[PDB]
Amino acid sequence: ATDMALALNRYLCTAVLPLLTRCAPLFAGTEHHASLIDSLLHTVYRLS
Numbered sequence: 001a002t003d004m005a006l007a008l009n010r011y012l013c014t015a016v017l018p019l020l021t022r023c024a025p026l027f028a029g030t031e032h033h034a035s036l037i038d039s040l041l042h043t044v045y046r047l048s
Helices: 005-021 036-047
Strands: none
Touching: none
């Protein structure tokens, strides 16, 4: 219910999430980066 949370959700869904949507193809080369992307998956699932 906090308003800062609303502002941060607006920031994410307006700027960060699209950028990463359309920066998708470069994500293929992550075989031997195994942690940060796994963290991002869980953060995105919690956001959803």
